Enzyme design. Structure first.
Site, PDB file in Angstrom:
ATOM      1  NE  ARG A 153      25.821  41.109  36.368  1.00 23.63           N
ATOM      2  CZ  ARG A 153      24.852  41.718  35.697  1.00 23.63           C
ATOM      3  NH1 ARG A 153      24.951  42.986  35.328  1.00 23.63           N
ATOM      4  NH2 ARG A 153      23.756  41.032  35.384  1.00 23.63           N
ATOM      5  CE1 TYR A 202      51.249  34.080  39.972  1.00 23.39           C
ATOM      6  CE2 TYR A 202      49.336  35.008  38.882  1.00 23.39           C
ATOM      7  CZ  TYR A 202      49.952  33.964  39.530  1.00 23.39           C
ATOM      8  OH  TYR A 202      49.268  32.792  39.750  1.00 23.39           O
ATOM      9  CG  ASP A 208      49.999  41.243  42.482  1.00 21.88           C
ATOM     10  OD1 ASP A 208      49.712  41.060  43.684  1.00 21.88           O
ATOM     11  OD2 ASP A 208      49.819  40.378  41.600  1.00 21.88           O
ATOM     12  CE  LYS A 239      48.540  32.876  45.385  1.00 22.77           C
ATOM     13  NZ  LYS A 239      48.414  33.858  44.282  1.00 22.77           N
TER      14      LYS A 239
HETATM   15  C1  LIG Z   1      20.166  37.853  33.892  1.00 21.69           C
HETATM   16  C2  LIG Z   1      20.833  37.869  32.553  1.00 21.69           C
HETATM   17  C3  LIG Z   1      22.210  37.803  32.382  1.00 21.69           C
HETATM   18  C4  LIG Z   1      23.141  38.206  33.493  1.00 21.69           C
HETATM   19  O1  LIG Z   1      23.695  37.140  34.247  1.00 21.69           O
HETATM   20  P1  LIG Z   1      24.293  37.581  35.686  1.00 21.69           P
HETATM   21  O2  LIG Z   1      24.618  36.234  36.333  1.00 21.69           O
HETATM   22  O3  LIG Z   1      23.127  38.257  36.323  1.00 21.69           O
HETATM   23  O4  LIG Z   1      25.513  38.430  35.475  1.00 21.69           O
HETATM   24  C5  LIG Z   1      22.761  37.471  31.154  1.00 21.69           C
HETATM   25  N1  LIG Z   1      21.922  37.141  30.118  1.00 21.69           N
HETATM   26  C6  LIG Z   1      20.557  37.164  30.293  1.00 21.69           C
HETATM   27  C7  LIG Z   1      19.657  36.792  29.154  1.00 21.69           C
HETATM   28  C8  LIG Z   1      20.009  37.511  31.520  1.00 21.69           C
HETATM   29  O5  LIG Z   1      18.677  37.569  31.762  1.00 21.69           O
HETATM   30  C1  LIG Z   2      49.036  33.806  43.199  1.00 21.09           C
HETATM   31  C2  LIG Z   2      49.206  35.132  42.527  1.00 21.09           C
HETATM   32  C3  LIG Z   2      48.188  35.775  41.834  1.00 21.09           C
HETATM   33  C4  LIG Z   2      47.023  34.997  41.284  1.00 21.09           C
HETATM   34  O1  LIG Z   2      45.835  35.044  42.057  1.00 21.09           O
HETATM   35  P1  LIG Z   2      44.776  33.864  41.726  1.00 21.09           P
HETATM   36  O2  LIG Z   2      43.726  34.049  42.822  1.00 21.09           O
HETATM   37  O3  LIG Z   2      45.597  32.635  41.918  1.00 21.09           O
HETATM   38  O4  LIG Z   2      44.216  34.075  40.349  1.00 21.09           O
HETATM   39  C5  LIG Z   2      48.272  37.125  41.534  1.00 21.09           C
HETATM   40  N1  LIG Z   2      49.352  37.841  41.992  1.00 21.09           N
HETATM   41  C6  LIG Z   2      50.343  37.218  42.717  1.00 21.09           C
HETATM   42  C7  LIG Z   2      51.509  38.016  43.217  1.00 21.09           C
HETATM   43  C8  LIG Z   2      50.261  35.862  43.002  1.00 21.09           C
HETATM   44  O5  LIG Z   2      51.204  35.179  43.696  1.00 21.09           O
END
Ligand SMILES: *Cc1c(COP(=O)(O)O)cnc(C)c1O
Ligand SMILES: *Cc1c(COP(=O)(O)O)cnc(C)c1O
Ligand SMILES: *Cc1c(COP(=O)(O)O)cnc(C)c1O
Ligand SMILES: *Cc1c(COP(=O)(O)O)cnc(C)c1O
Lengths: 393, 393, 393, 393
Positions: free
Chosen positions: B56, B109, B183, B208
């Protein structure tokens, strides 16, 4: 279910997603093309209903996984997230507003707690705690502002099993409109059918058993009809999604989930039974083991076990003893996460567990060892564990 | 920079990440293995500092991208997200608490606006708006509780360019501790060096131009030293991450970003110049075109242009005229997103633009057409556009 | 063609393959499902004609790439292989049998030569050799059993450009039904339209410029209508295919091939012109540089240049000088392959090249340096080369 | 072995390949960078010994898989191919030359036969045939020029199991230096330890059970020390390799191979036992079922069964009956390949099988049905088969 394995093999696999292959196609996309204005209008109207509209909503690959997850967990919809921790944080956030109160089991996953105490707290949302075995007594903790009751059964690390029927009944008596959630990762969503118990949303770190190979991260949240739209639209406003390839790999993991879990159950219960007879073990926390906290609920409410459990040694190992023990395992590896093909070992000091058990004190003082039992020959794992014991005898 | 292309080719590519190949390895992982307790302690201490600890937080593939993004945008760290919209929502959330106020350009946006009005509002965080050309006058809108000032230059769809030096100066005069965000997707982070202008965090939909092929979604946020730790730790508490493969594909997109952007600049400015002479065009919104809102700032503050711009037709097309126009293009495709190799076309009705310009009214009444100019032969694109004009003459 | 960039962006992208996205779907499959016996029969009849049948024939992803390659190179079909060397070996093998003779340029890629001398020879197929500038005089080398004439223009390493019109006209006078093949990797199949010159099969290491990023490996062979069925069926009998993901990444590479090649041409011609003036350089072997062997055929017959070429130093470096030169470059890297975004350098002594020029000697005595000119800023690459020259002066 | 499951989980997973993760990294590369001339020389010397040299030889990902396959099958090296058919064709080709003779079981996979009759024959290599139960009598078919003896146990479709000890002992008496090869796909290389029986090379379609999910295609060939260098170098001269991602997915498949095969064995033996009692079934061809051809050798020489087998109906179906039967299954699907999580069905008339039994006739007259038994609940599969029987009774 006498048909769970058939369901696992087939869930989500419709011709519109597979296009002739056994598995769904992998459709990688931000841009989804509208051939005509009428197609764009139709896609816009149905942009949350499985019509191709924009990659942030999903492609065919996501739709296939969503359908599989809803079939298997019996929900109206399934939200997707970059990991389990994102699923927990954003599913809670989707239903709280300033002035609300969250009631969370104090055995919840630590990042779930920290989301509550470090993120929700600063946004005018408070969080109270309850002991995993509170049963119907949870009615006494429900406040007038309590919007979310957050379950996790079995609990993280210490593995205590809720009496979900008792908790849900009490909650519905005092605050019927509450949103009841469960982190159902340990059961992989299929050994405990959360939405059948009146829980509103079943959350998973699909990272664990659904992926099943320790090489992908993804979160899921399957909601009943009452809660789906709020979950879906608020998670989307937070930009929550998973990439198409990991969605494909989660669908793929489902296909072997039955054979994997049966082996994890068999092997881990054998190890737990051996540990329970061992002179260097003070307690074994395995939901399938007679005597573990909430075991009788596991027998009544679950259709099987996975391979993660823990046990308490006879002593709080020092740093030096921890190294002699953990550094020299041959098959168990030290790592976070679990639910893969390999066996894992981690140590938690009792004081550290106490620190993530808010408004509670632990009832053990030995070092806690959490084991993930993988797909290795169980006798080899036992020999590894025995060698570990000899290094600290 | 006379060395930008060399930088793009080389950024993030250190031996510890590439291990002998030209590109970083793809390390897919939840579990990262600690060989010893001492390794685990070291990894824990440095779990936010580029030591392998848990998926993570990232694997080698993420670390390579993070280093590349920090080199190119001149930041202390780079947070990764499942998409651009997640980067915006979670970067803002990382710095607001109940009672805070957000000051956001009303050209932001639309999902960024909706995050503010539909998520932040319910958490005790208010949002006010400002016109993209407010310049130093933005000092008059800063409230005592204003924690975040959110820029987007050029603006979404309508392409107005901020006077960032004027905005930042005013902001630092009234509320020096404020978090200024931008942004910076349109510039792909490299045509406008946001952190050099005193902005604290530069956010991108890497979806993008960084991905550059319309087949991956990912968000980034590069923060200065002042803000990095709060961004990093709060984004992580929300479970925000990207999968290793998309991180690899973003690093890979960087390598061609220079050659791509130079073509997008050349081709789109040519199309914009032609449109500006066209009898069926009322206005051309291209930052590199003399006469566009904020153009003089673009000349002063940017080192080039990308390929996204818009223009206003002589009339508000009906639904029927929209179909005759848009349905029959041969090369331009109707789709959301942009920044890929192909040319795209979308229509926005003036009333619809008005609806996403809070506390403002638009100054045009014709249908607005947003063009992404891709890598096709520019003369073919012009012929396509001319055919479009003939269908609505 | 004045439409090549539009064709590169659009080739192979039909809705049946893209199913709503910009790029083709990635369909990973061995099994392809027949809903009925009649569907199975239809797929069987059309198993080489783009109907889903079995993954060894391809999935939608392969079909999309095959259509793109046939459009761009003007062929009737495109066979796919695990790498370029497999495409060369299996395309030659598809057209020979015991007793046949192959006539190959003595500047052919060394693995291609080794396939002929170490595999074909023990299968009863002989190989003869010709100087790349032989032109019409190749007629004198055609034997009664000559079945394949194998061209490579420019040649490997030393970059000699054939007079293809003269060679083809001569072959067709003596052996009109010979199979004329070319390894067209340097042109990426688009800078030299081999099939328009009467060559039957155009082979590429798509590994190089089509992939464009030094990661994927893949071979292609585009055949005219006369030769396609034999190529297709005999390569299939050897099990030659590529994985769906690499096929997707090859299609994707096509989209930026125009903008990349223009940069490689511009930068490598500049470097070549500079080296040609340098006192430590005896000769520059670049097809686009006046004076280089066959340059006039390049100028007449090609529509541009890529970025690979070589030069000969004014002296034979000692081993100490080779290390001082090669080990200390800052931007150029030592590696095999080419066609990616980064610049590469390799060295060969004259006798090394002589050993892979069958039945010929070399006409130089200085150390030969092969350069791939990537996408870095060319003035930085020149400074790196100048620093190298200073280390050996 | 009582350690096979532990070996499957751990094979090939050394730190130099995993670099902190559980699974090997995915290193996508053609170019591999040499930091110095001395490093280049070292890589060159060790280019077939696991030192990074060029992507056609492999990257870390391929090396990890190669080590895993050598450990599991007990060989000196493992060559990788784009699919199983390529592994068969190129492994045979690596050991033959004009004038040689190949002796192949007449139950060999049809593409393997076609490679021999349609490719090898015109290269001056002849192929003779033997009945799979020939045993020691194969000595009488060994010619002065017999170079390769090619086994396949169980045989394709009809599932006859060789007496490998008797065959190998006889071959070694007459031609001790013959190259004995087996297509060991059905055993997945682990249910039959071919190299321990004196076979020189064990070939697999890793496409089948090693990949295990019907998506990837890949071939492997594990050779003993006597044969490895010739296999390796001659397959490399034909450009045979697999992409890094499929190599990763093959390693990954190994990890669940034990739990999958145990389920395929249990379920397919149950189905076979049931079919054997059924009045509409004339014969069951399953290596694990008593009475099946060579069953006693399976029981002596194998450590288990996979899930592929066939049976012969009590009658010859008409075309109308074939459609009524095959078109209307609910769980079984018609497709080629096998070894995945789902169940498959195909049919062949006796004369179809006779046409691929060279120099032999078939000993049955009913329609033959080939089943792959996947991971579905076996009682559901039985109900599907019963419903099929009812459609043709
Ligand atoms: C491992 C764990 C998570 C975390 O999920 P991630 O994909 O690692 O963010 C959430 N809940 C439980 C019970 C977990 O063991
Ligand atoms: C396309 C857009 C986003 C969104 O990003 P996603 O990956 O589509 O969630 C954010 N900011 C601007 C300026 C965008 O054009
Ligand atoms: C790269 C090269 C090949 C071989 O391609 P691989 O993909 O590396 O097997 C073939 N021909 C030419 C001219 C080459 O440069
Ligand atoms: C599947 C099959 C092959 C061919 O493998 P592909 O990967 O499909 O080319 C080879 N041998 C056997 C026994 C097979 O069943």
């Amino acid at each position: 279910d006498k048909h769970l394995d058939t369901a696992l093999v087939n869930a989500g696999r419709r011709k519109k997603y597979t296009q002739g292959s056994v598995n769904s196609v992998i459709q990688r996309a931000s841009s989804l093309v509208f051939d005509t204005v009428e197609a764009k209008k139709h896609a816009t109207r149905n942009r949350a209903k499985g019509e191709l509209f924009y990659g942030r909503r999903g492609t065919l690959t996501h739709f296939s996984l969503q359908e599989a997850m809803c079939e298997l967990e019996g929900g109206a919809g399934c939200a997707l997230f970059p990991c389990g921790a994102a699923a927990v944080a954003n599913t809670i956030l989707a239903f709280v507003e300033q002035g609300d109160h969250v009631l969370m089991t104090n055995t919840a996953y630590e990042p779930s707690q920290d989301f509550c105490t470090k993120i929700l707290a600063k946004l005018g949302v408070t969080t109270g705690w309850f002991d995993p075995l509170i049963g119907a007594d949870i009615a006494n903790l429900i406040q007038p502002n309590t919007k979310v009751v957050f379950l996790e059964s079995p609990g993280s690390i210490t593995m205590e099993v809720h009496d979900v029927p008792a908790i849900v009944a009490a909650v519905r008596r005092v605050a019927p409109e509450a949103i009841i959630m469960i982190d159902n990762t340990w059961a992989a969503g299929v050994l405990f059918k959360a939405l059948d118990f009146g829980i509103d949303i079943s959350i998973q770190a699909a990272t664990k058993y659904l992926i099943g190979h320790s090489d992908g991260m993804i979160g899921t949240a399957v909601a009943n009809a009452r809660c789906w739209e709020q979950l879906c639209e608020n998670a989307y406003l937070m930009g929550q999604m998973i990439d198409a390839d990991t969605a494909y790999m989660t669908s793929r993991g489902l296909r072997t989930l039955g054979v994997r879990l049966r082996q994890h159950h068999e092997s881990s219960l054998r190890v737990a039974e051996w540990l329970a007879q061992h002179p260097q073990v003070a307690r074994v926390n395995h939901p399938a083991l007679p005597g573990s906290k909430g075991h009788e609920f596991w027998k009544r409410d679950f259709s099987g076990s996975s391979g993660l459990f823990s046990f308490v040694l006879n002593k709080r190992l020092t740093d030096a003893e921890l190294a002699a023990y953990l550094d020299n395992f041959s098959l168990f590896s030290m790592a976070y996460s679990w639910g893969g093909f390999e066996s894992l070992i981690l140590a938690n000091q009792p004081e550290h567990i106490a620190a993530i058990r808010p408004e509670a004190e632990v009832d053990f003082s030995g070092t806690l060892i959490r084991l993930h039992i993988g797909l290795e020959n169980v006798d080899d794992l036992l020999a590894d564990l025995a060698a570990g014991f000899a290094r600290i005898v």
